A paper describes a structure:
Bacterial RNA polymerase (RNAP) holoenzyme initiates transcription by recognizing the conserved –35 and –10 promoter elements that are optimally separated by a 17-bp spacer. The MerR family of transcriptional regulators activate suboptimal 19–20 bp spacer promoters in response to myriad cellular signals, ranging from heavy metals to drug-like compounds.
Three additional structures containing RNA transcripts longer than 4-nt were determined from the complex reconstituted with a full set of rNTPs. The stress-induced conformational change in the σ3.2 loop likely has been transmitted allosterically to the promoter-EcmrR binding interface and led to EcmrR dissociation. This in turn releases the kink and under-twist in promoter spacer DNA, which relaxes to adopt a B-form-like DNA structure. Whereas the specific interactions between the –10 element and σ2 domain are maintained, the conformational change in spacer DNA extends the linear distance between –10 and –35 elements and rotates the –35 element out of the angular range for σ4 domain interaction. We propose that for transcription initiated from the EcmrR-dependent promoter, EcmrR dissociation and the accompanying promoter spacer relaxation demarcate the beginning of the promoter escape process.
Author numbering:
A (entry chain C): 3 to 1341
B (entry chain D): 303 to 804
C (entry chain F): 512 to 562
D (entry chain D): 1308 to 1357
The structure:
RNA sequence: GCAGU
């Protein structure tokens, strides 16, 4: 079966056999950054592509060149953990091998004079840890992926949003990856207009004249010509028949045969069929047929050299009789059939003022740089650098692909710059769409919208840095010292490092990691964000980008999204969702070849998802594969309908394909409303890890995937046997099958003990395996925070009853019994670092000392002689943690305290107490103290003590891992030596250091002895190489901020118990604040006396229709009911046959469930270990949308001898009398969310005030003051509370002379105010007067 | 100079050293972050705290629960002055140290200084003037405020994480306005419409509805009682159920034309629970005010009648007593939502099969060209909405009267005691629009643009919604959520414009 | 932290101000000194008020 | 409208406080206006009894 | 920026 998952097997109620296992959930981040940093030979991705994009850098003249050979990534100076402790970025140095090639002065082809190649250093790039996070200035950050608009061309419209006339106005838009936007559009009178960078619009033919097209070439491109070969007969007209489609023929058509349609009729396609079947191509038209027709060619008089008719000029009868004198047989004319063809280009050329290339370039220049006089070689360089220069415009590979795919070209690859035919084809497709021959694009289709991830954004910022360097190198190669300099005298690392640094630290998408539980991390890494640089802004994003498109099915979760202002802008990647090679989300589907649903899987993106018919995952099918129903529900084009079995092309790969990893953990998701499911998926990510992790009795089976794919747990890399288990480490003796030759064969796993998360929780790894037991590859070795035997345990299985209890659960409140506080269920450890920074003031240095002025001697009891607290010291609020004093001067005390000094003689001290104290309300244990001392500052006794502790710990850990590895190497040597020439009773006496030089006869295994001895010697060498480095990193100085002398960081560990106010929740959106902690004897209780742990409200179920929280309860009653039977069989010490029988009955139960747990193969010891793990309730798995039916829940309730209705009779704890109706009692999985009332409660009487305005400061960190804002002032104005309002304005915020008087009056027993003018009004009168305006106060 | 006065008014804004535009003099005084709106019309305020709210159903209408550790900071100068005055501290420095150490005497002082001292409780957004109400604090030991249940509807406050700010009125005028103008006992009518806003709600309404209903063959039916006290005796002794139809001697007073209360004693055909509830009804009200199953509107009408007839001082007592007795008899009810409470009508599958057959015949009428896709779409929509209304009517007809029970052997139907129906019919929580999605079908859903999809969700939440039905429902769920999140910034702006005009 | 409604300017307190507890301490010390110098001979009490 | 009537009050403190501070303040300056603190906002701005 | 109401 397994070994870690037959300790305790979760009974699966899933019924559809899974075809694709859930992928590695963090492969988005890791695959993206791997594509960024790794070496690319062909130069397509990451750093190699960014170097080849810029290099070789040629000089302005061409005498020297700077080319790029290769790059390398250095070794990071500090480990991940050393970067988290020293508060520095975990990065790697970028060592680029450059080459300066210099020629002679006059060379034939650029023949070289010298080549100077060397390894320049340009910046450090932050490395990504093996869990997808970045350690940047010590904090772990996640660069959230971005859903942005794919580069390409997009045709769209406004649906009569303009001119109030119902005329849809179309617009094409070329969006490059990097470059300038290019818009074409139709105005309400069908004139094509162009815009660049969304500035004011030109006529669209101005850009056609910027290209070298003349007017007749423009009309040749955008039209087809009708030709009048004016024969003897009046205007003998050449004709193709289909031009006659759908118009009111007021002229008759006669050509050697019938008069086809009489004058004054509209003609139909059968008339065109008639004209093409009798084969007439040359007809006779009336004379006025040219009146209105627009000429196509520039008709000139060869007699006089004068153009008698310009192109795009409306031919008339007088002008026709004019040019007919010149002897012109053929008259070309633009064929404009209304409602099939447009005058748009001709009526556009009638508007623009330009008639040649230079005038159009000048008009584009006046559009672009207005008020600057345009010259020829300035305008004709501006236009050529807008769209057609490969360094100022990039329609990238995905942009070129989408561009060619829109215009229906055959190639997917091309150039990154625009061309003549690209712009012509965009205008042509826009005109086609205007003529009804196409349809506008959907801008929020997930095939018009793509994923830009950490490894692409980082490459973009690195390329920005490289071009900031390229400009400087071009400014440097234009000098005359080119014969003495090396390429590292030209490269400033600060541009590159500053670009990469600001992206990784201070971007909108590089976010402080949400580290509450494993789920918070694993769903912050799978985050998609429409916001960010190059995306939307949450204030200007409409209702339509925030919607659930039909193309999010399988690519983006519909449920998991925020609830505030950015909803639908922050999305969560669904479970099986993947990215294309271009960044388009694709999702897997099983091919259905002939009705047999093949287990072959194909990842379809959103554009190719609509060509097919795709069956549901809920579609029934036999073992053969055919759909047993005959009308399968499928998705054809974005709409859903029933199809025959033969039409179906693909099928969903799973039922949790559509929901994210956060919403796939909600059991019975199919019974909750989508609002409540959204709230539950958002509130699971806020649960804090409790002391002892408790698995869900009702889960969905995704617990193990979420707990393993997040790096919170310790997973065995190679299988083996646990050689040594300990709360701080696990030592695994690897199996002989899995160890390489020349290797100790021992894996050591050092566990994270009691460290601070980003959200001040405790992350702490507990060993799961026992000593000597066998482990496999992939088995969870040590739990993490919120992890129970490798499953994801975000909360505790509290026994709930749904009944109203005396109003204490009114309006979503939670009644909690005292046995939840007794049993320490939702007690959570929280770790806070507090920093005491001894700085260098200008009056002198602040010192960390224990002789603090005017403080008690009992307050300094917990400080050591160096002024710092002891480790293990139980501190409460106000206690001094780090004793510090700042030197002060210029006292200038008032005469009364001067006399007070004269009488008693206590002379004031020159120093001020600035020590670090525990914040009020916080009470915990000091668990760590770090002292960072600036180099040159002498270390106090505590810093030297901490350093000797660190050196002893480093030396002891390195020596212990060397002892472990060398013991494994010697065990392997002993195993090899007894494989042939066995000295097993001679080798036990020979000491271990003598076994290397023991020559064995060399059949083959002497090569093994060579490699093991070499491994041992290099292990001994590496131990010293690591120990000296650890010693020099410990005893070295710290690179602190300038001005600070030392920093003492005290790590408090608080234990927050549950209390009224703490927000608790379930997985189904049923949040609630604890309103009372009720005694055990006050709770309702069943006929056996078991009281109820938590009493929830029935009224919170039916209106917000989260029925899942009922079924989870009814099934959690069933699960625990199984456990309460196994526990009973474990108390009577029943034989293992009866336990095996009952556990097999509990695992066999269900209607054609997909799992088979056969306990016939379990040994009796494995059955007993399983039954001991199941005595607290059998964990049940209800997968999302194929989970447990209500009939199966009732069958499980019958198995555990429970009432199948899920409802028992309770009795009141206080009065002992039975509640009149049966109450729903069961086991709901409750979560303690991170909104704790300890961190919410805050109050001030007075305190620090603001600087410019004298109002109180902001928040509970700055001691607060509540904003009595504008709506509350209207509330006090709606009552007649004029004095309450006045004292809220004057003597509580701003009346500086008035609030001190108010305090002294409240103290002297006189509740009276003397309000003056608020200081903000004086600030306002002084700020209006600093404008040229005289505002006054009259009297 | 023009960038100093108004940056960005003429052309390009000057940006310095962060590539962010410099804040000019005109930007200091204008906008949502200018002096006028951010520092002069509303401002941060001393003597103000904030915490999470919890129920505290034991309170009277004028009381809040204030944490001792919040009230010790909000009232610090009051405690300093009372320590100086009572001789317990020789100085204000000594009193400060005593409050800092939290001696046992500063808690007695703190009980003294808050005695008749109101505090204002405020839940932002303060949409109307009942979003700030005064309360007398009762010192509790928690860290969360205990907000009386009856005022929650005024604040729009549920206890799912809401926080509220507490402000201390310092002066005698401020205390007397908190007591006379803003106290929650003065605020029992709404200023928008004259209707009660201190009004019972989900648990209270459900308790009073369960108590005031009648059952057909209930325990203790038919006896004759000497009054409400004997009815309470029988119920507490377990000699009669709260719904037993019974005959109670009721004395009721009516305000005569002169203005005093004249009595009348009559045997009323009642139930035991209405007799019990009569004990809390003040005197000038008639017996017809409780002799009915009391839903939310009947209770609101009870309170409005008491306010018009008797006045404010009897009405606050009646409101607190109504809350206590509703909570009590909802606790005794054991009213619980199970999964069998959502009874699906057994006609749902055949109604849905009939509608599927009908849309198949309209589909073959479309395949045979008799109807265009527009009228086909409309007819399929109407014969799905007819099926939805049929399923809802069959569900509610099954759900409202499933209680058939025996009176002297003869079966007899009565109103259902189903918990889902008892909550909906009370008006406690929910309407038939949600019961229809629990036990009926949840019908036609719309696309993101508003065009309703031609095939409905033929499932409910008691059964499952499959992957496609659930995705189709998320279409409209997120639209509702985005409109909720984006129309508060429009209604607040309308309210602001109206306030500044009027 | 890219939070527009907040700025660096409204976390900076005015340190030059005097705490109203210290204002009350100063006025109480004035009162106490005035009484305990009223408990003396006017000559020497004025010598102390004058010195 | 409620905006065009809020901005057209005879009290420039209320109108400048409402919105379009710049237009209101320039109109009030070149008009040499006077505001007698008669409504509620002008007495909340200056810290008086309403 | 990210959450809570
Ligand atoms: C080789 C690979 C498939 C062939 C092509 C197809 C899509 C191309 C990427 C996208 O264009 C986005 C982005 C544009 C930047 O300009 C350069 C980097 C990025 C990541 C491109 C790299 C590379 O060119 C890609 C991966
Ligand atoms: C059982 C196992 C193989 C036999 C032996 C061989 C090497 C031994 C460890 C090392 O000595 C380092 C360290 C010494 C401490 O003192 C106790 C703990 C450690 C981890 C030891 C545990 C145990 O003793 C080990 C694993
Ligand atoms: Mg709330």
């Amino acid at each position: 079966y397994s070994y870690t998952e037959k300790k305790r097997i979760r009974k699966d109620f899933g019924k559809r056999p899974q075809v694709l296992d859930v992928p590695y959930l963090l492969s988005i981040q890791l695959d993206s950054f791997q594509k960024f940093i790794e070496q690319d030979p062909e130069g397509q991705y990451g750093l190699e592509a960014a170097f080849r994009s810029v290099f070789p850098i040629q000089s302005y003249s061409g005498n020297s060149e700077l080319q790029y050979v290769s790059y390398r990534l250095g070794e990071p100076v500090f480990d991940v953990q050393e970067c988290q402790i020293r508060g520095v970025t975990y990065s790697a140095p970028l060592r680029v091998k450059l080459r300066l090639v210099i020629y002679e002065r006059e060379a034939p082809e650029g023949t070289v004079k010298d080549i100077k190649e060397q390894e320049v250093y340009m910046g450090e790039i932050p490395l990504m840890t093996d869990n997808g996070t970045f350690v940047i200035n010590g904090t772990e950050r996640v660069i959230v992926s971005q859903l942005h608009r794919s580069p390409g061309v997009f045709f769209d419209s406004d649906k009569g949003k303009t001119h109030s006339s119902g005329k849809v106005l179309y617009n094409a838009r070329i969006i490059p990856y990097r470059g300038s936007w290019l818009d074409f559009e139709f105005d309400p009178k069908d004139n094509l207009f162009v815009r660049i960078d969304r500035r004011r619009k030109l006529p669209a033919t101005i850009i056609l004249r910027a290209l070298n097209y003349t007017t007749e070439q423009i009309l040749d491109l955008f039209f087809e010509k009708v030709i009048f070969e004016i024969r003897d007969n009046k205007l003998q007209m050449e004709l193709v028949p289909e031009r006659l489609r759908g118009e009111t023929a007021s002229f008759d058509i006669e050509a050697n045969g019938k008069v086809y349609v009489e004058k004054g009729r509209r003609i139909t396609a059968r008339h065109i069929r008639q004209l093409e079947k009798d084969d007439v191509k040359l007809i006779e038209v009336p004379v006025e047929y040219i009146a209105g027709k627009v000429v196509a060619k520039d008709y000139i008089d060869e007699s006089t050299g004068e153009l008698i008719c310009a192109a795009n000029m409306e031919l008339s009868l007088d002008l026709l009789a004019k040019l007919s004198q010149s002897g012109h047989k053929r008259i070309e004319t633009l064929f404009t059939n209304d409602l099939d063809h447009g005058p748009y280009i001709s009526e556009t050329l009638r508007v623009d003022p330009t008639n040649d290339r230079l005038s159009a370039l000048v008009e584009i220049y006046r559009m672009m740089r207005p008020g600057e006089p345009p010259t020829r070689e300035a305008a004709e360089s501006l236009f050529e650098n807008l769209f057609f220069s490969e360094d100022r415009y990039d329609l990238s590979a995905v942009g070129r692909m989408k561009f060619n795919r829109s215009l229906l070209r055959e190639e997917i690859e091309g150039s990154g710059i625009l061309s003549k035919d690209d712009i012509i084809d965009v205008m042509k497709k826009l005109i086609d769409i205007r003529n009804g021959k196409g349809e506008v694009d959907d801008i929020d289709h997930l095939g018009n919208r793509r994923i830009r991830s950490v490894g692409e954004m980082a490459e973009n910022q690195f390329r920005v840095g490289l071009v900031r360097v390229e400009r400087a190198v071009k400014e440097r190669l234009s000098l005359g010292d080119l014969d003495t300099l090396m390429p590292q005298d030209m490269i400033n690392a600060k541009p590159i490092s500053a670009a990469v640094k600001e992206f990784f630290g201070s971007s909108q998408l590089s976010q402080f990691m949400d580290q509450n539980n494993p789920l918070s991390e694993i769903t912050h890494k799978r985050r998609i964000s429409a916001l960010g640089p190059g995306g939307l802004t949450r204030e200007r994003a409409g209702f339509e980008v925030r919607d659930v498109h039909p193309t999010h099915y399988g690519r983006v979760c519909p449920i998991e999204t925020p609830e505030g202002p950015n909803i639908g802008l922050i999305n969560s990647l669904s479970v099986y969702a993947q990215t294309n090679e271009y960044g388009f989300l694709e999702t897997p589907y099983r091919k259905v070849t002939d009705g047999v649903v093949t287990d072959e899987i194909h990842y379809l993106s959103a554009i190719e998802e609509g060509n097919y018919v795709i069956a549901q995952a809920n579609s029934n099918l036999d073992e053969e594969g055919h759909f047993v129903e005959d009308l399968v529900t499928c998705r054809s084009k974005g709409e859903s309908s029933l199809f025959s079995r033969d039409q179906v092309d693909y099928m969903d790969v799973s039922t949790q394909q559509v929901v994210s990893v956060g919403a796939s953990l909600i059991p019975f998701l199919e019974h909750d409303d989508a609002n409540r499911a959204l709230m539950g998926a958002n509130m699971q990510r806020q649960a804090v890890p409790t002391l002892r992790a408790d698995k869900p009795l009702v889960g969905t089976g995704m617990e193990r995937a979420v707990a393993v794919d997040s790096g919170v747990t310790a997973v065995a890399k190679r299988g083996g046997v646990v050689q040594y288990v300990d709360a701080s480490r696990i030592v695994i003796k690897v199996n002989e099958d899995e160890m390489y030759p020349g290797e100790a064969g021992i894996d050591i796993y050092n566990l994270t003990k009691y460290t601070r998360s980003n959200q001040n929780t405790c992350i702490n790894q507990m060993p799961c395996v026992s000593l000597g037991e066998p482990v496999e590859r992939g088995d969870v070795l040590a739990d993490g925070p919120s992890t129970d035997l490798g499953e994801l345990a975000l909360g505790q299985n509290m026994r709930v009853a749904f009944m109203p209890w005396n109003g204490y659960n009114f309006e979503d409140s939670i009644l909690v019994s005292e046995r939840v506080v007794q049993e320490d269920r939702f007690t959570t450890i929280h770790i806070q670092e507090l920093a005491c920074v001894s700085r260098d003031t200008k009056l002198g240095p602040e010192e960390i000392t224990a002789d603090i002025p005017n403080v008690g001697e009992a307050a300094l009891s917990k400080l050591d002689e160096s002024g710092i607290v002891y480790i293990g010291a139980e501190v409460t609020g106000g206690d001094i943690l780090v004793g510090k004093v700042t030197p002060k001067g210029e006292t200038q005390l008032t005469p009364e305290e001067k006399l007070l000094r004269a009488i008693f003689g206590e002379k004031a001290s020159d120093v001020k107490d600035s020590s670090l104290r525990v914040p009020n309300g916080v009470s915990g244990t000091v668990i760590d103290v770090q002292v960072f001392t600036r180099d040159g500052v002498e270390k106090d006794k505590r810093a030297l003590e901490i350093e000797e502790m660190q050196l002893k710990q480093a030396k002891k850990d390195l020596s212990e891992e060397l002892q472990i590895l060398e013991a494994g190497l010697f065990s392997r040597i002993r195993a090899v030596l007894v494989a042939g020439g066995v000295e097993a009773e001679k080798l036990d006496k020979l000491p271990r250091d003598r076994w290397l030089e023991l020559g064995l006869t060399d059949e083959e295994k002497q090569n093994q002895l060579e490699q093991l001895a070499e491994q041992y010697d290099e292990l001994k060498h590496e131990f010293e190489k690591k120990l000296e480095a650890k010693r020099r990193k410990i005893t070295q100085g710290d690179d602190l901020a300038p001005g600070v002398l030392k920093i003492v960081k005290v790590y408090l560990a608080v234990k927050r118990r549950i209390q009224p106010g703490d927000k608790m929740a379930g997985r189904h959106g049923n949040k609630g604040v604890i309103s009372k902690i009720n005694p055990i004897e006050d709770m309702p209780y069943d006929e056996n006396g078991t009281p109820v742990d938590i009493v929830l409200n029935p009224l919170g179920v039916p209106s917000r229709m989260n029925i899942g929280q009922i079924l989870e309860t009814h099934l959690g009653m069933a699960a625990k009911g199984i456990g309460d039977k196994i526990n009973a069989m474990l108390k009577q010490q029943q034989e293992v046959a009866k336990l095996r029988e009952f556990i097999q009955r509990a695992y066999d139960l269900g209607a054609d469930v997909r799992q088979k747990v056969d306990l016939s193969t379990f040994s009796d010891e494995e059955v007993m270990r399983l039954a001991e793990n199941l005595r607290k309730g059998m964990p049940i798995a209800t997968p999302v949308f194929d989970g447990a039916k209500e009939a199966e829940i009732k069958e499980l309730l019958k198995l555990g001898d429970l009432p199948t209705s899920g409802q028992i009779r309770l009795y009141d704890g206080r009065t002992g009398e039975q509640f009149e109706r049966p109450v729903t009692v069961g086991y709901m999985y409750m979560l303690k969310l991170n909104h704790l009332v300890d961190d919410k409660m805050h109050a001030r009487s007075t305190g620090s005030y603001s600087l410019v305005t004298q109002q109180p400061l902001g928040g509970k960190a700055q001691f607060g003051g509540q904003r009595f804002g504008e709506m509350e002032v209207w509330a006090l104005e709606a009552y007649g509370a004029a004095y309450t309002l006045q004292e809220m304005l004057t003597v509580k915020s701003d009346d500086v002379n008035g609030r001190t008087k108010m305090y002294k009056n409240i103290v002297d027993g006189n509740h009276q105010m003397e309000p003056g003018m608020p200081e903000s009004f004086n600030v306002l009168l002084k700020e209006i007067r600093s404008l040229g305006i005289n505002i006054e106060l009259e009297d | 100079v023009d960038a100093l006065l108004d940056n960005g008014r003429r052309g390009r804004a000057i940006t310095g050293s962060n590539k962010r535009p410099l804040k000019s003099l005109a930007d200091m005084i204008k906008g949502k972050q200018g002096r006028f709106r951010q520092n002069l019309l509303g401002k941060r305020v001393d003597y103000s705290g904030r915490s999470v709210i919890t129920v505290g159903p034991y309170l009277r209408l004028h009381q809040c629960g204030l944490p001792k550790k919040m009230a010790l900071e909000l009232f610090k100068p009051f405690i300093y002055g009372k320590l100086e005055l009572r001789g317990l501290a020789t100085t204000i420095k000594a009193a400060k140290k005593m409050v800092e150490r939290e001696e046992a005497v500063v808690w007695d002082i703190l009980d003294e200084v808050i005695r008749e001292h109101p505090v204002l409780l405020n839940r932002a957004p303060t949409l109307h003037r009942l979003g700030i109400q005064a309360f007398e604090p009762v010192l509790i030991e928690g860290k969360a405020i205990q907000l009386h249940p009856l005022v929650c509807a005024a604040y729009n406050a549920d206890f799912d994480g809401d926080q509220m700010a507490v402000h201390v009125p310092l002066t005698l005028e401020a205390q007397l306005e908190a007591r006379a103008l803003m106290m929650s006992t003065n605020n029992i009518l709404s200023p928008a419409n004259g209707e009660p806003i201190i009004v019972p709600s989900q648990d209270v309404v459900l308790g009073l509805y369960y108590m005031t209903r009648d059952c057909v063959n209930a325990k203790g039916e038919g006896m004759v009682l000497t009054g409400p006290k004997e009815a309470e005796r029988l119920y507490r002794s377990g000699l009669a159920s709260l719904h037993a139809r019974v005959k109670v001697r009721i004395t009721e007073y009516e305000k005569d034309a002169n203005g005093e209360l004249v009595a009348k004693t009559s045997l009323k055909d009642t139930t035991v629970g209405r007799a019990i509830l009569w004990m809390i009804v003040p005197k000038g009200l008639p017996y017809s005010i409780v002799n009915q199953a009391l839903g939310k509107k009947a209770i609101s009408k009870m309170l409005n009648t008491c306010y018009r007839i008797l006045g404010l001082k009897p009405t606050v007592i009646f409101a607190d007593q109504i809350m206590y007795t509703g909570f009590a008899y909802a606790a005794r009810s054991g009213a619980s939502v199970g999964i069998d409470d959502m009874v699906i009508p057994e006609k749902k599958h055949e109604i849905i099969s009939e509608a599927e057959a009908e849309v198949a015949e309209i589909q073959e009428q479309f395949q045979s060209g008799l109807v265009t896709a527009g009228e086909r779409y409309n007819k399929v929509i109407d014969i799905w909405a007819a099926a939805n209304d049929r399923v809802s009517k069959a569900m509610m007809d099954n759900l409202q009267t499933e209680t058939v029970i025996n009176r002297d052997g003869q079966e007899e139907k009565q109103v259902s005691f189903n918990s889902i129906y008892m909550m909906a019919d009370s008006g406690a929580r929910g309407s038939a629009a949600q019961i229809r999605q629990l036990a009926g079908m949840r019908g036609l859903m719309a696309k993101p643009d508003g065009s309703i999809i031609e095939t409905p969700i033929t499932a409910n939440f008691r059964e499952g919604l499959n992957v496609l039905q659930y995705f189709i429902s998320t279409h409209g769920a997120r639209k509702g959520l985005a409109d909720t999140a984006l129309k508060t910034a429009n209604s607040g702006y309308l309210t602001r414009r109206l306030v500044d005009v009027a | 932290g890219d939070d527009e409604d907040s700025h660096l300017g409204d976390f900076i307190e005015d340190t030059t101000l005097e705490l109203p507890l210290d204002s009350a301490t100063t006025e109480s010390l004035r009162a106490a000194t005035h009484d305990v110098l009223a408990g003396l001979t006017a000559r020497e009490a004025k010598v102390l008020r004058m010195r | 409208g409620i905006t065009k009537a809020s901005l057209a009050t005879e009290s420039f403190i209320s109108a400048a406080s409402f919105q379009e501070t710049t237009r209101v303040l320039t109109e009030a300056a070149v008009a040499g206006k006077r505001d007698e603190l008669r409504g509620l906002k002008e007495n909340v701005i200056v810290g008086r009894l309403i």
